[PDB]
RNA sequence: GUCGACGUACUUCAUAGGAUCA
RNA sequence: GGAACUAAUUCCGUAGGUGAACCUGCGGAAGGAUCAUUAAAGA
RNA sequence: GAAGACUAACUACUGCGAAAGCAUUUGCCAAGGACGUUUUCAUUAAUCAAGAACGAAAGUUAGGGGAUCGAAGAUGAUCAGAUACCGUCGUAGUCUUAACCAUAAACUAUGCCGACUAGGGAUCGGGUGGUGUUUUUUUAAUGACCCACUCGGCACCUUACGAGAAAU
């Protein structure tokens, strides 16, 4: 769950 | 000869108990329409000697003892056996 | 205006041609004014319109249609019906042209189309006013255009798998909505 | 004396084309379909539409120089049915009843030394 | 609504079709089969078969079968003689 | 049209929904109100959606003189064409051809529900509740398990139905994540469409088709033209670049060898991020 | 806006030497405009004539011929030989059940070097006191018949140019030679040749073509 | 968790046929 | 917006399935109702 | 003209193969059953846990090919009935080389070897006989048929003396 949350933040970066 | 043999081959392959049952029914009808006690007394004597048409036979005792004759088709067959034997034992 | 046809005869319909010839050459000669000749040295019927007697230009093709429909397998009187009226066509198709069947599957398919004692075939004819001959695999249908499309749709519903009771039921519904019109 | 041309009768489910060309095949003098002669789309292939087609072609070619035709009639062929239906023979009948002289009827459907798949799948197409 | 059929005569099996052959009162079917009812061929154009006789033209019925012996004249198995049961057993023994 | 005749699965469906005394139930496809009246007892206000005005007339006849007569609205028409009002749980029996639309319409609501008790066909539900690596893990499971969470309740066997149909049914509790996560929808779906075409071939297989490389080349061009950065030399058309681009991702994140019907959700995230990082988008 | 049959000009197709009814028929082109002269548009057509209508016969009602236009002069256009074939209805009516079908082809180059491929068909038959009903061959006969037919077609083509081969194809001599040379092996009714088709016409050589209609 | 696949345990559905009489 | 002025068939194996009360691709089975014609090198 | 599949009618569930299966010609390679035999060895055999070769269609890995049809997908219609629930493009596949997988109503819903028990007509292969027919060379000689026999196959009919509850 932790890993998922960090990657979704990094995807907020490249929208 | 060849046409009759081709027909008989193709019919020999059809074993499907409704089709054979239908053909036998209308055969027994035509046999009765189109086409003496001593033969009957010999047949009754052999039937009482043998008791072949009662439910101590291997097929029937198998079906009965394993609850398989409550389905009504094998009950059809079992009753047919019993009435055939009862035809023989009549006097 | 002298003109001809010549149409061949396959051998299983050569006995019934030379066995029913006596009813064939009359209603090709007087009623139609047409000059038959059957060749045997090439097994074929030949027709020719002779310019004197004839009136109807469609006589030659009328006769050729008649003999050909006798050739494909239809009995004499039915082919005579092809000779008389002006609204009669034949449609031929196969069993491998609906669904590729072979082996035993194909002999069972012809068993469903023909029915026992012919019954199923006759039902399709009687409730559609068409005439069906059912050859080795090729199936031939004679009638008028709308009727043969009805009988084609029932036959093709029988090849593909549907049982025969369903096609009696749908057949009598078709008969109802046919006879009113 | 006479002048001959060929009449190619494609007879599909959903039409009939009556084409009339020369002997050579290349130059065409009269194409009508069945579709030009009934504007209902019910029945592009109906025998009546075929009759009207053939009458039009017979008239148009008689207005050229051409007095006799050899007919080459074909169904779809290929990997579909292989025998002319009713549309082709209605066109043929109404072409013989037209004052053209017809000689040498034949039947050229394409028939394969067995070929590719047929549309439809394992379970057959039309019903 | 009672109906009144006047003067009767009462018959069953053979003599109806003996004197129903006299016109188009009666036609037949294809030969029937099974065991004891198998068609025998004496020739390519001559045979002995059990047949059931049909009687009603457009809506009708059928009598009891008969060992009819027939031949084929100009492409039709034309019925000829009414063989009985035992005669048919002999004539099927012979082939 | 089938009728849930069993009067005991009905109560269990209702009370698993945990209806509070201040809820707005949507209740889609009510039928003849064998089920509805329980919801009328336990909810403040019910919104039943129906298409057969015969059923609607009979159902509104059922509530007459009853104290719950004023706590039921009926909306007619096709369900997939209305505008649903706010509703707060959802209970559904509706015939199964809308089973896949329905779910996504609930997930894509504005202010979605909180819990919904849905009835489905057994194999459909077993797609929805299938973890990565099972035989049934499909594309549908990866979508729905991203935006929701789906939990079995019971089996409804096929002899509780008039007339008895052929397929077994399931009762399933679906519950939407809140907030819905902030990956896109259309990028997620584009990636899953590509990599789940052939579920058990490896992932690099799905990036070999020439339809797909055409799609990705078109998208990459339109992305650069969105940022106005003019294009280099390509040996075929542009997919050349894209080709090695794709391979490089399928070297780094390792995923170009695992088989997409065994890869759980974080792996699709890592793949999505890696393609986003090198300038690829899926819609 | 055109009515195209205002400008097309009829021509007439003439058969080669080795046929009786040398006249065949008419055809349309277009008028010979400068910028697309007509003569360069005629010079590849093939015409189908059913050689009854080319030899007066009537047992030649099958066997269509294909004639190819190669030269043109003054509203005559002179033709050649392009190939030969059966009509599909005879061919469908030979092939029957309870007998076997032998077929053979060969590729062969003639004297004038036309490379052409020539086909041949034959069927077995029930010798006229045979009672058993089918008469298939035994497939070690069929390879003997196929080798015989192929040897005779190879030999008898390339001892001829093309015109000689053509007039050995009209009286059906090859049939009689096959029939004689193949009846110690098996009975074999219904021999034909059913097709011949060109593959390489060599080079033009006007001399032969104008030696035919000379 | 009214979870799945099993493993044990149990429940339940399918029984009338001929003859005579009314 | 307004005030208006007129008018009126049953399955087996395998692979998949996001409008799935089940559908489809490929190979296989009958445990699925055969009528009619049949020498035509009848040299 | 190019491309890649496929081998119609003949074609007979007859022929061959342990099964799955096998249908254009030609050659090459090696193999096989039956028949014939006054050859040869002389019990070398039958069935088989372990172990091993092959195993339709689908399916995976890596190349090639990619015409046709086409799981998935996308779209057109959703016109009372769908009785006549489908249209259009189509990824994987279908083809092939090298490895995997090892399943089918893989059917005769029927283990293998040996013996005995009845009458007939056909068909495939081999062999023996015949002042029979044709193929004549000019009479032979093969080949093709006809008739009788025999061994070995795939099937069919009629009856049981027999078996079954019955189909058979
Ligand atoms: Mg073992
Ligand atoms: Mg395989
Ligand atoms: Mg494969
Ligand atoms: Mg590959
Ligand atoms: Mg397509
Ligand atoms: Mg292996
Ligand atoms: Mg098999
Ligand atoms: Mg098994």
Short mmCIF file of N, CA, C and O in Angstrom, two decimals, chain D residues 24-77:
data_model
loop_
_atom_site.label_atom_id
_atom_site.label_comp_id
_atom_site.label_asym_id
_atom_site.label_seq_id
_atom_site.Cartn_x
_atom_site.Cartn_y
_atom_site.Cartn_z
N UNK D 24 -14.93 -10.59 -77.89
CA UNK D 24 -13.61 -10.47 -77.29
C UNK D 24 -13.69 -10.35 -75.79
O UNK D 24 -12.85 -10.87 -75.07
N UNK D 25 -14.73 -9.71 -75.31
CA UNK D 25 -14.93 -9.56 -73.90
C UNK D 25 -14.65 -8.18 -73.40
O UNK D 25 -15.24 -7.76 -72.40
N UNK D 26 -13.78 -7.44 -74.08
CA UNK D 26 -13.29 -6.22 -73.46
C UNK D 26 -14.32 -5.13 -73.54
O UNK D 26 -14.83 -4.70 -72.51
N UNK D 27 -14.69 -4.71 -74.74
CA UNK D 27 -15.65 -3.63 -74.92
C UNK D 27 -17.02 -4.08 -74.46
O UNK D 27 -17.47 -5.16 -74.82
N UNK D 28 -17.68 -3.24 -73.68
CA UNK D 28 -18.99 -3.57 -73.14
C UNK D 28 -19.97 -2.68 -73.85
O UNK D 28 -19.64 -1.54 -74.17
N UNK D 29 -21.17 -3.18 -74.12
CA UNK D 29 -22.11 -2.30 -74.79
C UNK D 29 -23.33 -2.06 -73.93
O UNK D 29 -24.01 -1.05 -74.09
N UNK D 30 -23.64 -2.96 -73.00
CA UNK D 30 -24.86 -2.73 -72.25
C UNK D 30 -24.78 -3.40 -70.91
O UNK D 30 -24.85 -4.62 -70.83
N UNK D 31 -24.65 -2.63 -69.85
CA UNK D 31 -24.80 -3.21 -68.54
C UNK D 31 -26.05 -2.66 -67.93
O UNK D 31 -26.20 -1.44 -67.85
N UNK D 32 -26.96 -3.51 -67.50
CA UNK D 32 -27.87 -3.05 -66.47
C UNK D 32 -27.84 -4.10 -65.40
O UNK D 32 -27.44 -5.24 -65.65
N UNK D 33 -28.19 -3.70 -64.20
CA UNK D 33 -28.27 -4.61 -63.09
C UNK D 33 -29.73 -4.90 -62.91
O UNK D 33 -30.55 -4.53 -63.74
N UNK D 34 -30.06 -5.56 -61.81
CA UNK D 34 -31.44 -5.57 -61.40
C UNK D 34 -31.76 -4.40 -60.50
O UNK D 34 -32.92 -4.02 -60.35
N UNK D 35 -30.74 -3.78 -59.94
CA UNK D 35 -30.97 -2.75 -58.96
C UNK D 35 -31.43 -1.45 -59.58
O UNK D 35 -32.04 -0.61 -58.90
N UNK D 36 -31.17 -1.25 -60.86
CA UNK D 36 -31.58 0.00 -61.47
C UNK D 36 -33.07 0.01 -61.73
O UNK D 36 -33.64 1.06 -62.04
N UNK D 37 -33.74 -1.13 -61.61
CA UNK D 37 -35.07 -1.23 -62.18
C UNK D 37 -36.13 -1.50 -61.13
O UNK D 37 -37.29 -1.73 -61.47
N UNK D 38 -35.76 -1.48 -59.86
CA UNK D 38 -36.74 -1.42 -58.79
C UNK D 38 -36.12 -0.67 -57.62
O UNK D 38 -35.02 -1.01 -57.16
N UNK D 39 -36.77 0.40 -57.20
CA UNK D 39 -36.24 1.23 -56.13
C UNK D 39 -36.98 0.92 -54.84
O UNK D 39 -37.70 1.74 -54.27
N UNK D 40 -36.81 -0.32 -54.39
CA UNK D 40 -37.36 -0.75 -53.11
C UNK D 40 -36.39 -1.51 -52.23
O UNK D 40 -36.68 -1.65 -51.04
N UNK D 41 -35.33 -2.11 -52.77
CA UNK D 41 -34.24 -2.79 -52.06
C UNK D 41 -34.72 -4.04 -51.32
O UNK D 41 -33.91 -4.78 -50.75
N UNK D 42 -36.03 -4.26 -51.31
CA UNK D 42 -36.62 -5.51 -50.88
C UNK D 42 -36.03 -6.63 -51.68
O UNK D 42 -35.57 -7.63 -51.12
N UNK D 43 -35.96 -6.40 -52.98
CA UNK D 43 -36.10 -7.31 -54.07
C UNK D 43 -35.28 -6.83 -55.27
O UNK D 43 -35.78 -6.71 -56.39
N UNK D 44 -34.02 -6.48 -55.03
CA UNK D 44 -33.13 -6.28 -56.15
C UNK D 44 -32.99 -7.56 -56.95
O UNK D 44 -32.79 -7.53 -58.16
N UNK D 45 -33.13 -8.70 -56.29
CA UNK D 45 -32.87 -10.00 -56.87
C UNK D 45 -34.11 -10.69 -57.38
O UNK D 45 -34.01 -11.80 -57.89
N UNK D 46 -35.28 -10.08 -57.20
CA UNK D 46 -36.54 -10.68 -57.59
C UNK D 46 -36.57 -10.97 -59.09
O UNK D 46 -35.94 -10.25 -59.87
N UNK D 47 -37.26 -12.03 -59.51
CA UNK D 47 -37.30 -12.36 -60.94
C UNK D 47 -37.89 -11.27 -61.79
O UNK D 47 -37.48 -11.09 -62.94
N UNK D 48 -38.86 -10.54 -61.24
CA UNK D 48 -39.50 -9.46 -61.97
C UNK D 48 -38.50 -8.36 -62.30
O UNK D 48 -38.47 -7.83 -63.42
N UNK D 49 -37.65 -8.03 -61.33
CA UNK D 49 -36.62 -7.04 -61.56
C UNK D 49 -35.63 -7.51 -62.61
O UNK D 49 -35.17 -6.72 -63.44
N UNK D 50 -35.33 -8.80 -62.60
CA UNK D 50 -34.44 -9.36 -63.61
C UNK D 50 -35.04 -9.26 -64.99
O UNK D 50 -34.33 -8.97 -65.96
N UNK D 51 -36.34 -9.52 -65.10
CA UNK D 51 -37.02 -9.42 -66.38
C UNK D 51 -36.90 -8.02 -66.95
O UNK D 51 -36.59 -7.84 -68.13
N UNK D 52 -37.18 -7.02 -66.11
CA UNK D 52 -37.10 -5.64 -66.57
C UNK D 52 -35.69 -5.29 -67.01
O UNK D 52 -35.49 -4.63 -68.04
N UNK D 53 -34.70 -5.76 -66.24
CA UNK D 53 -33.30 -5.59 -66.62
C UNK D 53 -33.03 -6.13 -68.01
O UNK D 53 -32.46 -5.44 -68.86
N UNK D 54 -33.45 -7.36 -68.25
CA UNK D 54 -33.10 -8.01 -69.50
C UNK D 54 -33.81 -7.37 -70.67
O UNK D 54 -33.24 -7.28 -71.76
N UNK D 55 -35.04 -6.91 -70.46
CA UNK D 55 -35.74 -6.23 -71.53
C UNK D 55 -35.05 -4.94 -71.91
O UNK D 55 -34.91 -4.61 -73.10
N UNK D 56 -34.57 -4.21 -70.91
CA UNK D 56 -33.84 -2.99 -71.22
C UNK D 56 -32.57 -3.27 -72.00
O UNK D 56 -32.27 -2.57 -72.97
N UNK D 57 -31.83 -4.30 -71.61
CA UNK D 57 -30.58 -4.59 -72.32
C UNK D 57 -30.87 -5.04 -73.74
O UNK D 57 -30.17 -4.63 -74.67
N UNK D 58 -31.89 -5.87 -73.92
CA UNK D 58 -32.21 -6.35 -75.26
C UNK D 58 -32.58 -5.20 -76.17
O UNK D 58 -32.11 -5.14 -77.32
N UNK D 59 -33.36 -4.25 -75.66
CA UNK D 59 -33.66 -3.06 -76.45
C UNK D 59 -32.41 -2.27 -76.79
O UNK D 59 -32.18 -1.95 -77.96
N UNK D 60 -31.56 -1.99 -75.79
CA UNK D 60 -30.41 -1.14 -76.04
C UNK D 60 -29.45 -1.78 -77.03
O UNK D 60 -28.95 -1.11 -77.93
N UNK D 61 -29.22 -3.09 -76.91
CA UNK D 61 -28.29 -3.71 -77.84
C UNK D 61 -28.89 -3.84 -79.23
O UNK D 61 -28.16 -3.69 -80.21
N UNK D 62 -30.20 -4.09 -79.33
CA UNK D 62 -30.84 -4.05 -80.64
C UNK D 62 -30.70 -2.69 -81.29
O UNK D 62 -30.63 -2.59 -82.52
N UNK D 63 -30.59 -1.63 -80.50
CA UNK D 63 -30.27 -0.33 -81.06
C UNK D 63 -28.79 -0.14 -81.33
O UNK D 63 -28.36 1.01 -81.48
N UNK D 64 -27.99 -1.20 -81.39
CA UNK D 64 -26.60 -0.94 -81.76
C UNK D 64 -26.28 -1.56 -83.11
O UNK D 64 -26.23 -0.87 -84.12
N UNK D 65 -26.04 -2.86 -83.13
CA UNK D 65 -26.04 -3.56 -84.39
C UNK D 65 -26.29 -5.03 -84.16
O UNK D 65 -26.28 -5.83 -85.08
N UNK D 66 -26.53 -5.37 -82.92
CA UNK D 66 -26.28 -6.71 -82.46
C UNK D 66 -27.55 -7.51 -82.33
O UNK D 66 -28.47 -7.13 -81.60
N UNK D 67 -27.57 -8.64 -83.01
CA UNK D 67 -28.77 -9.40 -83.25
C UNK D 67 -28.71 -10.77 -82.63
O UNK D 67 -29.73 -11.48 -82.63
N UNK D 68 -27.57 -11.19 -82.12
CA UNK D 68 -27.56 -12.50 -81.51
C UNK D 68 -26.55 -12.51 -80.40
O UNK D 68 -25.56 -11.78 -80.44
N UNK D 69 -26.80 -13.33 -79.39
CA UNK D 69 -25.92 -13.40 -78.24
C UNK D 69 -25.68 -14.84 -77.88
O UNK D 69 -26.55 -15.70 -78.03
N UNK D 70 -24.47 -15.11 -77.43
CA UNK D 70 -24.17 -16.31 -76.66
C UNK D 70 -24.26 -15.91 -75.20
O UNK D 70 -23.78 -14.84 -74.84
N UNK D 71 -24.81 -16.76 -74.36
CA UNK D 71 -25.03 -16.37 -72.98
C UNK D 71 -24.11 -17.17 -72.07
O UNK D 71 -23.91 -18.37 -72.26
N UNK D 72 -23.46 -16.47 -71.15
CA UNK D 72 -22.63 -17.07 -70.13
C UNK D 72 -23.18 -16.66 -68.79
O UNK D 72 -23.03 -15.51 -68.38
N UNK D 73 -23.79 -17.60 -68.10
CA UNK D 73 -24.54 -17.31 -66.89
C UNK D 73 -23.76 -17.90 -65.73
O UNK D 73 -23.19 -18.98 -65.86
N UNK D 74 -23.66 -17.17 -64.64
CA UNK D 74 -22.86 -17.66 -63.53
C UNK D 74 -23.47 -17.23 -62.23
O UNK D 74 -23.95 -16.11 -62.11
N UNK D 75 -23.40 -18.09 -61.24
CA UNK D 75 -23.74 -17.70 -59.88
C UNK D 75 -22.50 -17.11 -59.26
O UNK D 75 -21.53 -16.78 -59.95
N UNK D 76 -22.53 -16.93 -57.95
CA UNK D 76 -21.41 -16.32 -57.25
C UNK D 76 -20.18 -17.17 -57.40
O UNK D 76 -19.13 -16.69 -57.85
N UNK D 77 -20.29 -18.44 -57.06
CA UNK D 77 -19.14 -19.28 -57.23
C UNK D 77 -18.16 -18.97 -56.14
O UNK D 77 -18.47 -18.33 -55.14
#
